[PDB]
Design a protein around this ligand. Structure first.
Ligand SMILES: *[C@@H]1O[C@H](CO)[C@@H](O[C@@H]2O[C@H](CO)[C@@H](O[C@@H]3O[C@H](CO)[C@@H](O)[C@H](O)[C@@H]3O)[C@H](O)[C@H]2NC(C)=O)[C@H](O)[C@H]1NC(C)=O
Ligand SMILES: *[C@@H]1O[C@H](CO)[C@@H](O[C@@H]2O[C@H](CO)[C@@H](O[C@@H]3O[C@H](CO)[C@@H](O)[C@H](O)[C@@H]3O)[C@H](O)[C@H]2NC(C)=O)[C@H](O)[C@H]1NC(C)=O
Ligand code: CU
Ligand code: CU
Ligand code: CU
Ligand code: NA
Length: 499
């Protein structure tokens, strides 16, 4: 069952064995992935998060981010630790009380403390549209049509060396999959369809690192949503999905009744499908209960290319149709050396006082804010352009902006910008050496918004900056509840920190 929009959510430690290997984890709702949180567009969500964690090897503090939800007027509820809040301590709870006006689509929730979401705190978050403009394109859209893709590690996250190339031990599809080494024939996930029906498959990358080449043998996939943004219909036979991205696609159950492999090939870790790694099963009602015998093609003839995507609505692009054609045109210098990432020469290390609390306490320019050099102010009601030229080791880096979605004016592997009709999204691969992936948005959401690589090991190694959007209006725009004001005193007391 789905939970929400008003619900408790307990965060616990437990042993799990999603690939046959037992390890302890950090779980929401007792499962991996966590339960789907759901509601309708414009609903009030009140997710009361109970921190019941006791195992220090995965951190006993926590904080949860609602990925892709704008949090307008509720920056305090966004979740990134030491940007919008201090962590919730064990034995305490906290009500994330916000609204989702003007958004409907496929989202997710995850820990936003250190690398803790890798240890298991990740689940789907769906905002349905009762008047969805795509409703007539499918028959079925429910918890059974959500498909999660996850990396899974046998080593606990707090034992992963900072700045290292960290590699997973299994791909999990809907929480199940097989280990790349010492492979055992542990259970695979089954997605069940009825011959002749059409399904809104909500594909969610809950990855901490790898991108996946996702396909379904015998089937193609008609994309209708990208990171919450409705798209024109685009039919593909393979989707390369980067960490934290989401797609809805229509699956037409139009092949013979049977069993078909579902494939998710990561860019690192185990390559291929031997022993049923990187796999799940599409089963038609009436098929024999047995593994598929289908194969993949040698090459995919209609892969997703990001410049093929276009919004369903006439979203356009803000600003002027050339590079630098914005009120505030930025170019970030994105680098890596010696185990640490940097943006504009500064490696991100979380501050002791969350950025939002520094601003509410009166710090009002970005040079007054800590960490020094990690906070860039943005002017209000202005068109922002951010060029993100690639080259830093560990690519391709999927960059994500909190508080906003953005027009993808230039995509990976294509030097031509699009000022007319590019897709809008919230997480974008910045590509490879010599690329110049560039995003645009308008500043109508006061508050400090994190910008970072969504490979969680890279964020931990410093690949982030904070956009302090409209510092002067942050306090009036974001009134804070007493429980939020109580978080830093409690956290600092529990940890013997002075502030
Ligand atoms: C990606 O696109 C951005 C624009 O969106 C390019 O930025 C431009 O970068 C050049 C230098 O690479 C800038 O010109 C230089 O400016 C300084 C003075 O500020 C001057 O001293 C140098 O002689 C040179 O003129 C230009 O200002 C800039 N545009 C913006 C908005 O900052 C960037 O080069 C592209 N990167 C790649 C790898 O293609
Ligand atoms: C590289 O990225 C560029 C920019 O996103 C892509 O260029 C765009 O290509 C599309 C598809 O061909 C062009 O749209 C077409 O326009 C014609 C004329 O209006 C129309 O009859 C077609 O039905 C379609 O709308 C679009 O104009 C063009 N934009 C620009 C700025 O060049 C390009 O396709 C990408 N390269 C690859 C290999 O995918
Ligand atoms: Cu995220
Ligand atoms: Cu986010
Ligand atoms: Cu990265
Ligand atoms: Na425009």
């Amino acid at each position: 069952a789905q939970i929400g929009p008003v619900t408790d959510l307990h965060i616990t430690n437990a042993n799990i064995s999603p690939d046959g290997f037992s390890r302890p984890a950090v779980l929401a709702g007792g499962t991996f992935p966590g339960p789907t949180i759901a509601g309708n567009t414009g609903d009030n969500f009140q997710i009361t998060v109970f921190n019941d964690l006791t195992d220090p090897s995965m951190l006993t503090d926590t904080s949860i981010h609602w990925h892709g939800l704008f949090q307008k007027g509720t920056n305090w509820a966004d979740g990134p630790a030491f940007v919008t809040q201090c962590p919730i301590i064990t034995g305490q709870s906290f009500d994330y009380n916000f609204n989702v006006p003007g958004q409907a689509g496929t989202f997710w929730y995850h820990s936003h403390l250190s690398t803790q979401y890798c240890d298991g705190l990740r689940g789907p978050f769906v905002v349905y549209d009762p008047n969805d403009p795509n409703a007539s394109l499918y028959d079925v859209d429910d918890d059974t049509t959500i498909i999660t893709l996850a990396d899974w590690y046998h080593t606990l996250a707090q034992q992963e060396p900072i700045g290292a190339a960290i590699t997973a031990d299994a791909t999990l599809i809907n929480g199940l999959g097989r280990s790349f080494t010492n492979t055992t024939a542990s259970p695979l996930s089954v997605i069940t369809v009825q011959s002749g029906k059409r399904y809104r498959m909500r594909l969610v990358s809950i990855s901490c690192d790898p991108n996946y080449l996702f396909s379904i043998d015998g089937h193609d996939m008609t994309i209708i949503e990208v990171d919450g943004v409705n798209s024109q219909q685009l039919t593909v036979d393979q989707i390369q999905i980067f960490a934290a991205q989401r797609y809805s696609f229509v699956l037409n159950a139009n092949q013979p009744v049977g069993n078909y492999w579902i494939r998710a090939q990561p860019n690192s870790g185990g390559q291929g499908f031997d022993g049923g790694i990187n796999s799940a099963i599409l089963r038609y009602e009436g098929a024999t209960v047995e593994d598929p015998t289908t194969t993949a093609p040698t090459t995919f003839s209609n892969p997703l290319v990001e410049t093929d995507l276009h919004p369903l609505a006439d979203l356009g692009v803000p600003g002027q149709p050339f590079r630098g054609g914005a009120d505030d045109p930025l170019v970030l210098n994105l680098a890596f050396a010696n185990g640490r990432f940097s943006i504009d020469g500064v490696s991100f290390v979380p501050p002791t006082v969350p950025v939002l609390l520094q601003i509410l306490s009166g710090a009002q320019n970005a040079q007054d804010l800590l960490p020094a050099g990690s906070v860039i102010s943005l002017p209000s009601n202005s068109v922002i352009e951010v060029a993100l030229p690639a080259g830093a080791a560990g690519g391709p880096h999927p960059f994500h902006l909190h508080g906003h979605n953005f027009a993808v004016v230039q995509s990976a592997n294509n030097a031509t910008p699009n000022y007319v009709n590019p897709i809008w999204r919230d997480t974008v691969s910045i590509g490879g050496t010599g690329d110049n992936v560039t995003i645009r948005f308008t500043t109508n959401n006061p508050g400090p918004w994190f910008l970072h690589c969504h490979i969680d090991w890279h964020l931990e190694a410093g690949f982030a900056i904070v956009f302090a959007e409209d510092i002067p209006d942050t306090a009036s725009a974001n009134p804070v509840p007493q429980a939020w004001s109580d978080l830093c005193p409690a956290y600092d007391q529990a940890h013997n920190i002075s502030t």
